[PDB]
């Protein structure tokens, strides 16, 4: 998961109370070497009938079907990775029109086309630094929480469109504000230099959400 590590990193950053300082030097916590490679740019929750479909920033698409299987289309528009209930992975292609999986491939195309003609690409202004899939997700009233197979946890806030991309490997957070401006901070440096109340409260909620992910296991 890498989730336990993220919890500890978030516990530590929140413990330092970064917004409760005389002087706050948020800019000094910025680290461009820690910019994420992957994040979810688009998603669609039709899980009550079809499943959850998503797009990653590299333009690859994925669908979590209700039978707990997953299908991903790579950004070459043809290569597929199909993950079964038991975690068995297999390679197929759209162009081969595979007997077994046409119905699921067609559903993915529906998702793909919907996201393409309806939805904004999140973090389109970010240049990034094995392809991950969506391992776990849930929605609250305030946000959607997206746990990727590379350890990343993404949190999209509904009301103001602000977003957090948390990486436990870099021990880093990327924050996208309401004006689509993005920064990448090393968490240990946020402990040292501090941050605004806006980022601080979102990191507090993030910890609750990681606690939730870990407790739902």
């Amino acid at each position: 998961c890498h989730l336990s590590d993220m919890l500890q990193q978030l516990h530590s950053v929140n413990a330092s109370k970064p917004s409760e300082r005389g002087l706050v030097r948020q800019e000094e916590a910025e680290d461009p070497a820690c910019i994420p490679i992957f994040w979810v740019s688009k998603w669609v929750d039709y899980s009550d009938k079809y499943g959850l479909g998503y797009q990653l920033c590299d333009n690859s698409v994925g669908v979590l079907f209700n039978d707990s299987t997953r299908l991903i289309l790579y950004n070459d528009g043809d290569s597929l990775q199909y993950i079964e209930r038991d975690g068995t992975e297999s390679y197929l292609t759209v162009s081969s029109h595979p007997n077994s999986l046409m119905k699921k491939i067609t559903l993915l195309k529906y998702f793909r086309n919907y996201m393409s003609e309806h939805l904004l690409k999140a973090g389109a202004n970010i240049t990034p630094r094995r392809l991950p899939y969506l391992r776990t997700w849930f929605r609250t009233r305030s946000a959607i929480i997206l746990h990727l197979s590379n350890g990343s946890v993404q949190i999209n806030f509904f009301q103001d469109h602000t977003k957090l991309i948390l990486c436990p490997l870099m021990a880093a957070v990327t924050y996208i504000d309401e004006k689509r401006d993005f920064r990448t901070y090393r968490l240990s440096l946020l402990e040292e230099y501090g941050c605004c109340k806006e980022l601080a409260s979102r990191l507090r909620y993030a910890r609750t959400m990681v606690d939730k992910l870990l407790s739902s296991r």
Binding site: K42, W43, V44, D45, E117, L119, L120, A122, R139
Partner: peptide
């Protein structure tokens, strides 16, 4: 629900 629209 879906992500933010065009």
């Amino acid at each position: 629900m879906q992500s933010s629209p065009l």
